[PDB]
Amino acid sequence: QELSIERLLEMESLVADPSEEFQFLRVGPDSNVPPKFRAPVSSLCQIGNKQIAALVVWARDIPHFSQLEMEDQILLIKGSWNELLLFAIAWRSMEFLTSPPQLMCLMPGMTLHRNSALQAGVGQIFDRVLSELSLKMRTLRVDQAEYVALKAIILLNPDVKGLKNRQEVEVLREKMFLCLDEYCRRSRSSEEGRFAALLLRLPALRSISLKSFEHLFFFHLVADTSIAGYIRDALRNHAPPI
Amino acid sequence: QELSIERLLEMESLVADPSEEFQFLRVGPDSNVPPKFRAPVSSLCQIGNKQIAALVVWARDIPHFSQLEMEDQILLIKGSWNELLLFAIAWRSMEFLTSPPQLMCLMPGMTLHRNSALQAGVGQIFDRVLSELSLKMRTLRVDQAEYVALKAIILLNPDVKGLKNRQEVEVLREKMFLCLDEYCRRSRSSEEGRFAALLLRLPALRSISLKSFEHLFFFHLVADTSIAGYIRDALRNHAPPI
Amino acid sequence: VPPLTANQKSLIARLVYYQEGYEQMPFRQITEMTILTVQLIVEFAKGLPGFSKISQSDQITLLKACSSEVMMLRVARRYDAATDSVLFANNQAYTRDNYRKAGMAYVIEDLLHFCRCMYSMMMDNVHYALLTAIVIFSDRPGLEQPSLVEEIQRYYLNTLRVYILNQNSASPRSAVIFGKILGILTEIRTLGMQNSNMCISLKLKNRKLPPFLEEIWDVA
Amino acid sequence: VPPLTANQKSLIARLVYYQEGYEQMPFRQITEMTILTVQLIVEFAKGLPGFSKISQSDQITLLKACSSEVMMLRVARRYDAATDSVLFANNQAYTRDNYRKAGMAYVIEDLLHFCRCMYSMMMDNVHYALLTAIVIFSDRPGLEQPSLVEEIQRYYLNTLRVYILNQNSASPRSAVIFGKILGILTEIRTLGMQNSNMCISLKLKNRKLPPFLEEIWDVA
Numbered sequence: 001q002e003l004s005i006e007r008l009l010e011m012e013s014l015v016a017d018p019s020e021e022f023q024f025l026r027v028g029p030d031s032n033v034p035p036k037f038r039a040p041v042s043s044l045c046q047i048g049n050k051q052i053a054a055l056v057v058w059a060r061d062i063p064h065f066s067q068l069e070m071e072d073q074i075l076l077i078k079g080s081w082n083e084l085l086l087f088a089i090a091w092r093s094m095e096f097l098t099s100p101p102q103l104m105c106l107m108p109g110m111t112l113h114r115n116s117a118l119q120a121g122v123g124q125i126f127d128r129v130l131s132e133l134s135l136k137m138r139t140l141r142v143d144q145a146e147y148v149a150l151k152a153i154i155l156l157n158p159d160v161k162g163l164k165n166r167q168e169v170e171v172l173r174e175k176m177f178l179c180l181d182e183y184c185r186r187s188r189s190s191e192e193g194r195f196a197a198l199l200l201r202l203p204a205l206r207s208i209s210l211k212s213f214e215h216l217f218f219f220h221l222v223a224d225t226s227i228a229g230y231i232r233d234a235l236r237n238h239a240p241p242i
Numbered sequence: 243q244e245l246s247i248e249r250l251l252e253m254e255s256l257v258a259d260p261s262e263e264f265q266f267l268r269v270g271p272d273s274n275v276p277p278k279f280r281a282p283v284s285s286l287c288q289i290g291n292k293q294i295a296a297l298v299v300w301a302r303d304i305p306h307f308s309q310l311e312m313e314d315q316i317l318l319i320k321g322s323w324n325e326l327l328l329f330a331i332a333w334r335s336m337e338f339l340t341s342p343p344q345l346m347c348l349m350p351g352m353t354l355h356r357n358s359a360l361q362a363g364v365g366q367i368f369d370r371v372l373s374e375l376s377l378k379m380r381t382l383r384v385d386q387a388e389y390v391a392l393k394a395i396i397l398l399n400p401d402v403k404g405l406k407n408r409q410e411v412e413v414l415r416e417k418m419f420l421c422l423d424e425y426c427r428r429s430r431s432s433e434e435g436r437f438a439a440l441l442l443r444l445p446a447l448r449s450i451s452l453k454s455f456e457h458l459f460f461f462h463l464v465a466d467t468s469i470a471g472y473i474r475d476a477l478r479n480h481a482p483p484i
Numbered sequence: 485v486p487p488l489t490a491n492q493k494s495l496i497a498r499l500v501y502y503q504e505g506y507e508q509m510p511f512r513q514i515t516e517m518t519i520l521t522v523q524l525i526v527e528f529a530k531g532l533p534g535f536s537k538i539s540q541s542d543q544i545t546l547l548k549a550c551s552s553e554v555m556m557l558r559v560a561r562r563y564d565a566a567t568d569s570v571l572f573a574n575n576q577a578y579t580r581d582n583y584r585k586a587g588m589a590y591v592i593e594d595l596l597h598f599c600r601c602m603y604s605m606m607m608d609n610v611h612y613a614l615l616t617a618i619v620i621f622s623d624r625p626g627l628e629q630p631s632l633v634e635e636i637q638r639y640y641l642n643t644l645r646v647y648i649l650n651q652n653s654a655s656p657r658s659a660v661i662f663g664k665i666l667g668i669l670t671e672i673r674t675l676g677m678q679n680s681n682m683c684i685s686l687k688l689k690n691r692k693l694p695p696f697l698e699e700i701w702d703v704a
Numbered sequence: 705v706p707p708l709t710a711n712q713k714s715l716i717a718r719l720v721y722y723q724e725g726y727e728q729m730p731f732r733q734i735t736e737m738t739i740l741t742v743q744l745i746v747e748f749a750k751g752l753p754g755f756s757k758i759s760q761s762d763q764i765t766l767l768k769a770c771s772s773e774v775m776m777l778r779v780a781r782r783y784d785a786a787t788d789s790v791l792f793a794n795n796q797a798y799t800r801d802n803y804r805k806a807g808m809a810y811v812i813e814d815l816l817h818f819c820r821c822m823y824s825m826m827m828d829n830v831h832y833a834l835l836t837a838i839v840i841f842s843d844r845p846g847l848e849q850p851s852l853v854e855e856i857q858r859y860y861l862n863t864l865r866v867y868i869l870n871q872n873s874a875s876p877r878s879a880v881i882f883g884k885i886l887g888i889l890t891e892i893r894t895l896g897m898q899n900s901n902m903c904i905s906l907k908l909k910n911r912k913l914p915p916f917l918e919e920i921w922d923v924a
């Protein structure tokens with residue numbers, strides 16, 4: 001009802017308050033991450049942790065989101081935070097395009113170089129992110145409006161196993177489809193097959209996201225046991241953007 | 243007496259323990275760093291803070307360093323930590339060379355892109371670091387042995403205003419000159435004027451370092467008031483490398 | 485409400501037609517029945533307008549990657565609401581029991597949830613058929629000619645779109661129906677992975693995977 | 705112990721010779737005396753073998769940047785240990801008092817410390833002269849031909865090196881003596897900055913800096 005691309009677009013502009021640290025990602029005791037690299041790895045976790053918090057705060061102020069049952073608000077963020085980081089990395093990484101791409105932007109004034117990815121053994125995923133997501137989005141020439149819409153759609157996933165009110169999550173995702181479709185036919189008008197072209201990035205985002213967890217779990221970086229808990233507190237205690 | 247390039251070279255290999263966080267750098271209350279950039283800026287401070295701690299631990303185990311008066315151990319690290327970060331950034335940045343250089347490596351698997359520097363208004367300093375230090379060192383073809391020696395020489399600066407035992411700091415820096423000179427004439431042998439060519443980077447490192455403080459202080463990122471204190475505790479409490 | 489071009493209608497007809505003709509100790513069963521259907525899938529795929537325009541190694545790239553995903557669709561497509569389970573002409577192979585007698589029973593819940601979720605969408609055999617095609621022509625890693633495949637895929641994509649638009653009088657809900665269908669492409673990916681993970685498990689638990697699957701779903 | 709080539713000895717002689725011929729309300733004084741010496745420095749520089757080989761704008765680049773640094777050397781060079789202060793033929797300009805009557809008294813301690821530190825090195829007029837040259841031919845930002853300047857500088861660098869080696873019979877301590885001298889190049893940089901900072905201060909406190917300095921030490 002109030003959920004719209006125009007609204008999501010202005011939220012995108014708000015800034016998360018001094019990220020009340022939550023250990024979603026961290027290098028812990030007995031890790032297979034060689035000694036000389038924990039410091040770096042750990043600082044990258046530090047960063048993601050910050051992004052996740054900003055993400056948890058974004059989801060909260062999303063029209064009707066907080067009107068959802070708390071159990072669901074949790075499960076939803078819980079199931080999509082990873083894909084949302086990657087999607088954001090890929091959006092942010094487009095500026096550094098143009099041999100395959102060599103720079104991935106994890107945050108403003110911060111980029112991962114392909115070679116670091118190679119040494120890390122994460123070469124493929126690094127490349128999939130930059131071509132399947134970043135390059136394709138540049139080619140597809142996807143704008144911010146479509147970018148926010150897709151975020152909302154990724155978030156509001158009613159297929160999330162465990163929700164107590166699937167219908168409520170559906171009405172919200174469907175309103176998003178309605179919104180995205182309207183945007184495309186009233187602006188991108190000429191471009192046929194666009195609605196599907198955009199939405200076709202989602203399963204791409206999903207495969208990459210899954211491969212990510214393969215690695216994060218392999219190197220014991222995720223605190224799966226505590227994610228839900230962190231989201232629960234973040235939603236309630238964190239401070240609202242600016 | 244025990245201070246030698248061979249020894250410094252193996253120390254270089256040891257790893258600082260889970261960096262007991264010390265706020266040397268941080269974005270604090272009322273900062274002129276625009277909102278949408280505090281998060282990033284703050285994470286970079288987070289990183290430097292980690293490097294500084296590793297630096298404080300390096301200085302400690304340096305032959306005879308800890309045999310110095312505590313007041314001096316502090317003043318020395320206090321006066322050279324900034325130049326040592328930059329020197330390390332420049333050493334690390336050589337791998338990304340070859341339009342001017344575009345990548346600065348603040349840490350393994352982490353690079354600053356010139357454009358981020360431009361937007362940050364720190365374009366010149368970013369360029370001086372990559373040419374006056376990084377490029378020149380590649381050209382000069384300076385190896386790790388010379389790299390460690392120079393670090394030691396930068397650290398052991400007897401001109402540091404405030405020391406209570408200048409003579410003790412002198413004997414140590416002079417032993418370093420003796421060491422560096424011996425290394426050059428018993429290895430780099432053919433290369434004449436090398437000893438001075440290496441040492442000529444130091445005043446370059448100094449100017450750049452000073453320009454850095456110009457910016458860090460401008461954006462209220464330094465906790466000058468608390469540096470000494472942090473070094474004092476770090477020396478005593480921190481844990482030894484691996 | 486732009487009608488379906490005689491070309492698209494022939495395409496729908498063609499697919500709905502061939503789909504029917506491709507319907508259908510413990511672990512021993514499953515592995516075999518899967519092979520049968522995996523063959524029905526490969527045949528349905530090869531007879532798909534556009535499969536030929538594509539390179540030979542790219543066909544293997546698609547058939548290999550879409551095999552498990554489309555397998556998930558097949559099973560899901562036979563979910564009975566009344567008995568809340570999969571009535572796959574019950575070779576007693578894709579039932580909670582056999583999957584238990586076969587060990588891999590944990591996987592059942594994740595599968596059923598998808599069944600429940602897909603069932604609720606209320607898809608035509610047309611919706612379902614176009615989807616199977618669209619799945620097969622998705623951008624998979626290692627395609628020598630991604631641009632081409634994307635071409636082929638877009639033809640099915642647009643057919644599905646027009647079919648829905650006509651079926652709903654250009655109603656706004658069209659994007660909703662069309663949207664949820666493309667949403668399956670995403671959930672289908674996680675299931676495929678889970679399939680892969682199981683294979684990797686049999687590997688470090690040394691289980692017998694008939695060379696057919698051993699090849700189609702890799703081993704390295 | 706490779707002796708000084710007749711070419712280097714003539715160079716030392718030349719420099720030591722010209723250095724002697726260039727020896728030497730409150731704020732009003734300083735600013736003027738500085739100008740005089742800054743002129744002596746510019747003249748010493750121009751008569752330096754190699755200054756000509758360099759571009760015209762690069763000369764201005766060097767003279768502008770080395771001016772304050774070499775100024776620091778001049779003052780420091782006249783530090784009296786007994787009275788622990790600067791006996792610059794005391795125009796009562798470079799004394800704690802005038803610098804106080806001129807406001808900028810805080811700066812005194814930092815200056816003296818350098819004086820104390822430099823004094824302890826015990827430099828020859830040769831050490832000191834070669835150093836002034838070496839300072840002037842240092843790599844400064846904005847040089848059209850850094851490679852060239854570096855050329856010129858290396859000639860003085862090597863002279864200083866050989867002079868020290870001979871003065872010490874190829875003693876190991878040579879690297880120590882040579883090393884500490886190049887160390888001054890670094891401390892000299894911080895002083896230069898501090899000089900710049902003061903200029904910037906007069907700017908936002910609107911003080912009178914004779915156009916001579918206003919230009920040589922910028923204003924923008």
Ligand SMILES: C/C=C/CC/C=C/CC/C=C/CCCCCCC(=O)OC[C@H](COP(=O)(O)OCCN)OC(=O)CCCCCCC/C=C/C/C=C\CCC
Nearest residue numbers: 108109275276279286287290327354361362363454457458
């Ligand atoms: C010795 C250093 C070792 C480790 C690093 C220490 C942490 C301090 C941060 C230094 C990194 C700065 C560059 C990266 C910035 C990325 C953020 C960005 O794009 O900001 C734009 C924003 C537009 O604003 P907007 O337009 O208002 O305001 C623009 C005003 N310029 O800009 C800002 O918000 C300004 C941020 C100021 C950062 C301080 C620079 C400190 C320089 C230290 C020297 C080291 C070399 C440089 C590192 C790249």
Ligand SMILES: C/C=C/CC/C=C/CC/C=C/CCCCCCC(=O)OC[C@H](COP(=O)(O)OCCN)OC(=O)CCCCCCC/C=C/C/C=C\CCC
Nearest residue numbers: 033034037044045048085112119120121212215216350351
């Ligand atoms: C969803 C992500 C959002 C934000 C980021 C989350 C923080 C997790 C860290 C991810 C960045 C990894 C790449 C950068 C590494 C830099 C360190 C490096 O060069 O290590 C070499 C070392 C040689 O070891 P050595 O030889 O033993 O062992 C080598 C074994 N490969 O390698 C290691 O120590 C391995 C470190 C493992 C990092 C986990 C990768 C997680 C991938 C997430 C997917 C996102 C795209 C990739 C980001 C670039």
Ligand SMILES: Cc1nc(-c2ccccc2Cl)n(NC(=O)c2ccc3c(c2C)OCCO3)c1C(C)C
Nearest residue numbers: 514515518552555556559591594595675678679682
């Ligand atoms: C020979 C074989 N045949 C199948 C299969 C059987 C029915 C539908 C789809 C597939 Cl892929 N599987 N897959 C599963 O048994 C299976 C089924 C459903 C799932 C699942 C797996 C691994 O993973 C979680 C989601 O649902 C296997 C191996 C992997 C044992």
Ligand SMILES: Cc1nc(-c2ccccc2Cl)n(NC(=O)c2ccc3c(c2C)OCCO3)c1C(C)C
Nearest residue numbers: 734735738772775776779811814815895898899902
């Ligand atoms: C006209 C003028 N002449 C000088 C000067 C006077 C004597 C030696 C060197 C210099 Cl650069 N200064 N410099 C200083 O007064 C000065 C002297 C010593 C210092 C210092 C400054 C700014 O900064 C800190 C280190 O020692 C000025 C301006 C800047 C007032």
